[PDB]
Amino acid sequence: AAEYAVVLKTLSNPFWVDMKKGIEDEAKTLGVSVDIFASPSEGDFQSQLQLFEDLSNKNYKGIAFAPLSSVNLVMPVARAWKKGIYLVNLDEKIDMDNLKKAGGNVEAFVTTDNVAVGAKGASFIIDKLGAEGGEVAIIEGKAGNASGEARRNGATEAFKKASQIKLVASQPADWDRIKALDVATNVLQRNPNIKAIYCANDTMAMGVAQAVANAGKTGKVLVVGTDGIPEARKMVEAGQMTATVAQNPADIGATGLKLMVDAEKSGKVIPLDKAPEFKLVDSILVTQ
Ligand SMILES: [Zn+2]
Ligand SMILES: [Zn+2]
Ligand SMILES: [Zn+2]
Ligand SMILES: [Zn+2]
Numbered sequence: 001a002a003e004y005a006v007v008l009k010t011l012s013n014p015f016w017v018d019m020k021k022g023i024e025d026e027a028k029t030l031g032v033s034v035d036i037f038a039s040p041s042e043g044d045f046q047s048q049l050q051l052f053e054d055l056s057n058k059n060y061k062g063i064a065f066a067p068l069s070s071v072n073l074v075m076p077v078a079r080a081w082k083k084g085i086y087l088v089n090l091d092e093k094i095d096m097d098n099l100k101k102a103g104g105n106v107e108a109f110v111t112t113d114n115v116a117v118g119a120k121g122a123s124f125i126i127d128k129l130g131a132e133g134g135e136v137a138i139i140e141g142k143a144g145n146a147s148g149e150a151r152r153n154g155a156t157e158a159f160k161k162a163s164q165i166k167l168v169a170s171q172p173a174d175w176d177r178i179k180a181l182d183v184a185t186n187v188l189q190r191n192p193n194i195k196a197i198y199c200a201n202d203t204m205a206m207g208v209a210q211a212v213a214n215a216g217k218t219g220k221v222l223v224v225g226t227d228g229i230p231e232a233r234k235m236v237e238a239g240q241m242t243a244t245v246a247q248n249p250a251d252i253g254a255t256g257l258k259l260m261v262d263a264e265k266s267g268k269v270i271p272l273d274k275a276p277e278f279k280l281v282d283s284i285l286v287t288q
Pocket of ligand 1: 034
């Protein structure tokens with residue numbers, strides 16, 4: 001019988017391995033079979049494109065995919081739609097303008113709300129500080145980055161609703177660990193009583209952790225990252241970072257599979273002029 005396929009960005013790290021495991025568990029629950037793939041050449045747009053082309057010419061009734069880029073899978077996804085394959089976009093949004101021009105569509109898009117991610121980091125801080133609140137800072141990504149501005153907005157709006165919080169600094173460190181160490185050093189020098197710092201990514205958070213240690217404030221300042229990369233997860237366990245907000249890869253994969261399977265049951269792929277289904281899967285707070 002026709003099966004399902006999933007194309008992931010890679011299979012070489014715990015995030016994507018956990019997505020694979022989420023998919024496998026949900027397939028058992030739904031009683032469907034799934035084959036999970038990643039491109040042979042890591043990070044290579046063309047390698048992933050060739051993989052997806054080939055998979056579209058097998059016997060899969062649906063394919064879910066996490067594209068390496070908005071740009072790389074437009075044409076074979078359009079062809080797969082024309083063939084009646086049920087398609088679900090995971091994680092990184094395909095270039096939907098170009099996909100429409102190419103004569104295709106997808107059933108659904110499944111990702112995480114970056115506004116909520118920033119709110120979750122700020123909410124951790126708010127809850128931990130309690131009624132007495134205090135001075136806090138945000139270490140931003142590069143200005144104009146969609147994901148980074150969403151995280152900054154969400155954290156800022158969450159802090160604003162908490163009367164007891166004073167946002168004393170919000171400054172970019174451009175996704176860079178060395179810059180984050182420098183910015184955080186400057187921020188802590190100016191406001192030595194800061195009680196917490198939210199950073200828009202873990203690369204920057206690790207730099208901030210060093211800044212806090214250099215000031216003698218490890219265990220006295222809450223340091224919160226975003227992504228849950230392995231090095232930052234170790235810092236959380238060690239007390240060098242306090243928490244990090246991550247996506248829930250297992251839930252992204254399970255949700256994507258269920259949407260694919262539900263669509264397939266309808267007997268016809270989504271019309272070209274219909275907006276795909278849209279799911280923003282809840283993020284998770286990592287504190288151990
Ligand atoms: Zn198979
Ligand atoms: Zn506002
Ligand atoms: Zn400096
Ligand atoms: Zn843990």
